[PDB]
Write a protein that binds this DNA or RNA. Structure first.
Ligand SMILES: [Mg+2]
Length: 173
RNA sequence: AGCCAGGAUGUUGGCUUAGAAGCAGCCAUCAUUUAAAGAAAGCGUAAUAGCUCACUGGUCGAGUCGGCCUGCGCGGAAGAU
């Protein structure tokens, strides 16, 4: 578990050479008012600043909860340090949040989607496969607190489903 | 009606924004020092800044303002021997 945590934390370090240098560059050339006179430049700096800002708030957890863990977590987990081991649960959560953030933020990523499922060759077998696939996606939606709206469903003759087109809506679908 | 002066403070109201400081918007449209000063009507900017305006004090020293009813006119109004 500890090892896993460490591994997770290493990713966060992975974005230390990005944040510092970038920040420095931004303050050095972009922050300036005579650079600012061009809107595009300003916009660029703002984008650049965004990168910096992400790195600031979320790295603290990685550093602050790592360094404070070892002194109290070493020998005792059950007695007196039952808070102190599940104190690192908070850290884990933070890490997860960071990772998830990294994953998302990209174009159109919040707006819900409408996946069509199309079968392949095999004919009868294939339709069953399609159905199975559909089922899995439905269950995923169910799992993740989504609401699925069933639009197209088309049965195949010998068995299964030929064509389906399923639209789910909610939080970063 | 010109003319001379002010045209402030909390305050750059917060935000979301890239930034937003009356003036991109979205929204609240309040209170201060009071003669009076819009969380701002226009220009202006990255945006501030800056330049006007509202209202208000002075100067001057008689009429003035924009509706209503009706009279007669103007524009709108270009064609082929
Ligand atoms: Mg006529």
């Amino acid at each position: 578990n500890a090892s896993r945590n460490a591994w997770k934390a290493s990713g966060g370090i992975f974005d230390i050479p990005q944040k510092e240098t970038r920040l420095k560059e931004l303050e050095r050339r972009l922050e300036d008012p005579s650079l600012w006179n061009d809107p595009e430049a300003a916009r660029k700096v703002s984008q650049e600043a965004a990168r910096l800002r992400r790195t600031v708030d979320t790295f603290r957890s990685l550093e602050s909860d790592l360094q404070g863990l070892l002194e109290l977590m070493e020998e005792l987990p059950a007695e007196e340090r039952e808070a102190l081991k599940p104190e690192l649960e908070e850290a884990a959560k933070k890490l997860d949040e960071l990772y998830h953030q990294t994953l998302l933020n990209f174009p159109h990523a919040e707006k819900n989607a409408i996946l069509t499922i199309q079968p392949g060759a095999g004919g009868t077998e294939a339709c069953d496969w399609a159905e199975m696939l559909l089922r899995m996606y439905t269950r995923f939606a169910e799992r993740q607190g989504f609401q699925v709206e069933v639009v197209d469903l088309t049965p195949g003759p010998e068995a299964g489903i030929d064509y389906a087109q399923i639209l789910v809506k909610g939080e970063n679908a």
